[PDB]
């Protein structure tokens, strides 16, 4: 309705204000197909820190209505927003749906390049080894011992990245160690990843979500990400945010007066590529309170 145009307008305004590359033609094509899904579902607009002087911009939605599960992938394929090119990643969503009961799915979009990722949430958690029969990067299986040792073995969701041919695995933080700062410090050390600030370590004892990234091109775990919810702009730890991300916290568009946020901290190899911050506004006001 007005609601879809409202959302599309806000994304463009975000991209223009914060210096993100964007394509109106790609935004037009995405919204023609998924516009109503954005208005009717949990929906977030994300900016991130991947390059020092400009924020990238992404938008994503999460579908939990049982009757609609599977439609995102079917819609994406039939419309041509997602073509399978025989990539090892192109077979994973059908394998996942044939293997596990799915309780939610979602799609991530890049404002420049379009459909980027599809998520599938399992109905329950499974031992991660139950997933080893999927056509996942071989690095998932070869880290089975590491995943056990760090209690990253209660799997509940997959993220399938079609732009980068990578897979994110999301793990339930079930263990008493997941409530200690030492666990996160030790986890990043063991991975030889960039060390976290003491401020972040203290926040991470709230546990949040953890995701690990595996790529078909690499024998190594590529990246990991910690996610924490925040009930409003004032709750966000602003000392952890560069000036552009601080401006985003104070100006991100939403349909409530004081939206919540989900921040993600991505970590990669020490002195390498994958350490940066993601900030997602709870556009409708319904995502974070849950
Ligand atoms: Mg829905
Ligand atoms: Mg958790």
UniProtKB/TrEMBL annotation:
- Identify the residues that bind Mg(2+) 2: 172, 208-209
Q: Which domain of life is it from?
A: Bacteria
Where along the chain is Mg(2+) 1 bound? 41, 63, 65
Keyword list, A-Z: Metal-binding, Prenyltransferase, Transferase
Q: Which Pfam families does this chain map to? A: PTase_Orf2
Gene Ontology molecular function terms on file: metal ion binding; prenyltransferase activity
Do you know which InterPro entries this protein is assigned to? ABBA, Prenyltransferase_CloQ, PrenylTrfase-like_sf
Protein family per UniProt: Belongs to the aromatic prenyltransferase family.
Could you tell me what this protein is called?
AmbP1
Q: Which organism is it from?
A: Fischerella ambigua (strain UTEX 1903)
The UniProt gene name for this protein comes to ambP1
């Amino acid at each position: 309705m007005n609601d879809v145009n409202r959302i599309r307008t806000d994304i463009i305004n975000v991209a223009k204000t914060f210096g993100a590359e964007y394509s109106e033609k790609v935004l037009d094509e995405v919204f023609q197909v998924f516009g109503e899904q954005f208005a009717d579902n949990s929906f977030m607009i994300r900016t991130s820190n991947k390059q020092p002087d400009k924020l990238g911009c992404y938008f994503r939605y999460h579908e939990e209505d049982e009757s609609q599960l599977g439609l995102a992938w079917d819609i994406a394929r039939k419309s041509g927003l997602l073509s399978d090119q025989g990539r090892p990643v192109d077979q994973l969503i059908p394998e996942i749906c044939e293997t596990f009961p799915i309780m939610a799915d979602g799609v991530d979009f890049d404002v420049k390049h379009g459909l980027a990722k599809i998520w599938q949430s399992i109905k329950g958690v499974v031992p991660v080894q139950d997933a080893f029969k999927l056509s996942l990067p071989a690095s998932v299986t070869t880290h089975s011992d590491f995943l056990k040792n760090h209690h990253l073995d209660a799997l509940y969701a997959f993220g399938i990245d079609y732009h980068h041919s990578s897979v994110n695995l999301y793990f339930d933080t079930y263990h008493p160690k997941h409530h200690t700062s030492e666990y996160y410090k030790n986890l990043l050390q063991d991975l030889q990843f960039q060390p976290p600030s003491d401020e972040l370590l203290e926040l991470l004892t709230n546990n949040g979500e953890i995701a690990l990234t595996f790529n078909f091109a690499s024998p190594r775990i590529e990246r990991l990400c910690f996610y924490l919810p925040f009930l409003n702009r004032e709750a966000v730890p602003q000392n952890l945010l560069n000036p552009l991300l601080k401006k985003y916290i104070n100006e991100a568009p939403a349909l409530v007066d004081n939206p919540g946020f989900i921040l993600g901290w991505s970590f990669g190899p020490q002195g390498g590529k994958g350490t940066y911050t993601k900030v997602d506004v709870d556009y409708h006001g319904r995502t974070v309170p849950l």
